[PDB]
Design a protein around this ligand. Structure first.
Ligand code: BGC
Ligand code: CA
Ligand code: CA
Ligand code: CA
Ligand code: NA
Length: 177
């Protein structure tokens, strides 16, 4: 098992690939029908802010900060961009909660259930997700989708245990195979 989350980056070209990115179902549909343009490992999910489009030349590299060194290639540039992060939560039984600052939207699912989302376009804003209690014996899957419709782009995910303090989400909390 590898520490951190498995990262996938998708270039989306408004026009040829369809309309502006603006909702989770649309983003998920593009992901499901396409192979990622680059992969990476998300060890510390504190990315951006960058301006001039996440899909702009050199921009995903700047956005990913120290995680850029794990990109499999320099993906093609585009108007819009999608990131997916997947792994298993390396957590004992408990009740946890995400807080996310993002531009634009995102959805976090744990064991297939939505636990945080901003289903739309927005300037960078911070939103607290719902408390969730791990259910079943696991592994406890986590799946994050995120997009930039254009302009500025930021994604910072924090995780806490109920009654505790937020920590930047990453290798401390998740692994993948
Ligand atoms: O239009 C609302 C917001 O949309 C975001 O996608 C842009 O990155 C912001 O710069 C803009 O303020
Ligand atoms: Ca590029
Ligand atoms: Ca767009
Ligand atoms: Ca944006
Ligand atoms: Na493409």
């Amino acid at each position: 098992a590898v520490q951190g989350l498995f990262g996938e980056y998708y270039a989306y070209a408004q026009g040829s690939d369809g309309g502006n990115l603006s909702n989770v179902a649309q983003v998920k549909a593009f992901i499901a029908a396409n192979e990622a343009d680059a992969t990476f490992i998300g060890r510390n999910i504190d990315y951006g802010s960058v301006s001039g489009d996440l899909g702009g030349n050199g921009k995903v590299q700047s956005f990913l900060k120290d995680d850029a060194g794990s990109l499999s290639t320099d993906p093609e540039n585009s108007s819009d961009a999608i990131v997916k992060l997947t792994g298993n939560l390396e957590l004992q039984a408990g009740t946890y909660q995400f807080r996310v600052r993002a531009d634009d939207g995102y959805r976090i699912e744990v064991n297939g259930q939505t636990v945080a989302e901003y289903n739309g376009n927005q300037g960078a804003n911070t939103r607290t997700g719902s408390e969730f209690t791990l259910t079943g014996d696991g592994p406890h899957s986590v799946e994050i989708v995120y997009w930039d419709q254009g302009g500025a782009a930021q994604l910072r995910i924090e995780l806490r245990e109920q009654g505790g303090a937020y920590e930047i989400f990453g290798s401390q909390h998740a692994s993948h195979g």
